A paper describes a structure:
Fibrillar collagen molecules are synthesized in precursor form, procollagens, consisting of a rod-like central triple-helical region (∼300 kDa) with globular propeptide extensions at both the N- (∼50 kDa) and C- (∼90 kDa) termini. Though this collagen mostly occurs as a heterotrimer with two α1(I) chains and one α2(I) chain, small amounts of a homotrimeric form (three α1(I) chains) have been reported in adult skin as well as greater levels in embryonic tissues. Inside the cell, within the endoplasmic reticulum, the C-propeptides (also called COLFI domains) play key roles in determining correct chain association during trimerization, notably in cells producing different collagen types. While in general the amino acid sequences of the C-propeptides are highly conserved, Lees et al. identified a highly variable so-called chain recognition sequence (CRS) which appeared to be required for specific chain recognition during trimer assembly.
Author numbering:
A (entry chain A): 6 to 246
B (entry chain D), C (entry chain E): 8 to 246
Amino acid sequence: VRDRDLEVDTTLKSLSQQIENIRSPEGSRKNPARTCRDLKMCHSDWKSGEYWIDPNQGCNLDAIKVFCNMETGETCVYPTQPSVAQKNWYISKNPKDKRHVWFGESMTDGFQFEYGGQGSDPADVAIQLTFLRLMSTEASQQITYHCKNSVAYMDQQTGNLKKALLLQGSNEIEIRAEGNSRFTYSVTVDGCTSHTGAWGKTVIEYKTTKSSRLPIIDVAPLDVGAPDQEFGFDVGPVCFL
Amino acid sequence: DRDLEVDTTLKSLSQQIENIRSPEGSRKNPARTCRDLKMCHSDWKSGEYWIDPNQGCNLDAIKVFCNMETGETCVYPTQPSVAQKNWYISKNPKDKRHVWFGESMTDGFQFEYGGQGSDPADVAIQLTFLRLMSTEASQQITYHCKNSVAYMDQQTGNLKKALLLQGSNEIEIRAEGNSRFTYSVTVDGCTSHTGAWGKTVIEYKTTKSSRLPIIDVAPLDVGAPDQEFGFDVGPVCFL
Amino acid sequence: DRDLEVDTTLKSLSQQIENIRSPEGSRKNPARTCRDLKMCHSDWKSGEYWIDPNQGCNLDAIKVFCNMETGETCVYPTQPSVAQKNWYISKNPKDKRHVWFGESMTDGFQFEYGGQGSDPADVAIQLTFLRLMSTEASQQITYHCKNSVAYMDQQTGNLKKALLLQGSNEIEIRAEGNSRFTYSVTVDGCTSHTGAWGKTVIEYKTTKSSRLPIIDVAPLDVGAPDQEFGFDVGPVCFL
Ligand SMILES: [Ca+2]
Ligand SMILES: [Ca+2]
Ligand SMILES: [Ca+2]
Ligand SMILES: [Cl-]
């Protein structure tokens, strides 16, 4: 028989701690917070890093593992597969005709990008993203196009953007190099501007208040088709602030 | 003895906390959605539960059918059964005007959901939240007909006399045309005028869950005094 | 002995659990919306409460007026009162052009809400949630006018000089046109140039609540140095 007083005092501390964990979750997997923005706001001193969150609440078994930037409050959700190998992915029955073709939708062994990490169910994560968009004022994502004999953005020969690749946003919105300036991506470095027989890369960013457009789920290069034209991707996380 | 009052309180506090972390789906402790109940209690089975998708005060919680195989929350119409009779006499046998039951017929009404004496405005907020917490929705509706084509016309072999449906965000769902705004038909017993009762069963299923539930129906083959219809309106189910 | 200790701790735990299930709407224990407060505590009085519709951490709670007769949550502009003076001088008698106070006039600014020293980005997220939990929203604005038509022009009897409103959604709200996007007026003392102050009181009410609150105003009948105006901006109210 357990000593009664110590048992009661132990239950009391445990009940008190259970209530505290409801009020102030620590962002562990058993005890996930709502967003990184909430963690930051409520815990000024906590360090940037990995935390679990459950923005759609209810049952917490669908919580997602994310990086919180505690300087900015950003919640960053990683694609399930950050890295797409660098190789030839497509040969057209017509080398000379350069046209946009979707990696995920039309290329042998292509896939549309998924988010959350290898354990997750995408339908659950889609619900989580919906709540994250609701709890943020903007979102941003970066993607790197790795290139060998493949223009990504600016064509050095012509000086124009007509061979630039297309991105597919999350709600059937294309994001482009040109056009309406609220649907256009920006480019920080562009090492793909000519065919050199060597590898370069172009780094592309989209930031918007219309967070329904992110993340990116597909990429359509144009300057592809000939058999020595190779590319690959590093897909960054979609970050909500 | 006498102070196991304390053990009772401790057990009750512990249970109140558990009901918060993981609601049982009772009226007192409603869960958020059937999806959450299935997720948190994998051994629980299909049937009626109380949910509160919009949280806050729990007094506007709604009683639903949870399909615990799929995770669907199924929200019933307040009046599933609509009487079978002549609802409409036109100045005509121009039996080829769509006329809304709810917006236009005498004693017609647009369909409400939630059951009990739910307040429809509370329930609209709940449906708003169920849409956020699901990826698709579907709904079935039965058209009972007496001398009234529903979908296919045996005479002409075509759909030009098909009824149309109104969705929740005012979208019109039709027999033909764009694949996205199109309803399907499982059984079609309304194809000719025979003096007897028949029925036609219709489904719509979509990822644009704003379009559901159905709030109105506009038959076309109505107007003469010998033409009668009714409905069974199924639940709107969110997955 | 020290059952004083134990029963005091049991009470405190029972209370903290209560505060989570039924927040009181204080700054430390904010409720979700006024609607929820009314629903759960029908005896509570209209007044100032703190709410946190977006939940998570509660430090971004906003202070609101709850109308406990209606269930309305009213969120006040940070600066309800905009001074009455000449704000804009054109190269004019043209005319007769809409000029946005916020986007275009010197010293003009778009309207922020939440007050205290809230962060507009935080309040915008709260309004997103307020909109999800409400069926309807309204707001009233007063245009104080000296030699400036706001709505009806008495020399013409037309609304062609009526000011424009900018809603939160972008979305212009206008005197005329499609009826879902028009404002109404309950007072119009601006119909002629008298050299004295008058005012026009405008209201917009909609189920499409992402159009509210109003964030900017474009008068048309401005541009000369003798033309002056100011605003009293009402709360945006949600139900
Ligand atoms: Ca969850
Ligand atoms: Ca509720
Ligand atoms: Ca909050
Ligand atoms: Cl929520």
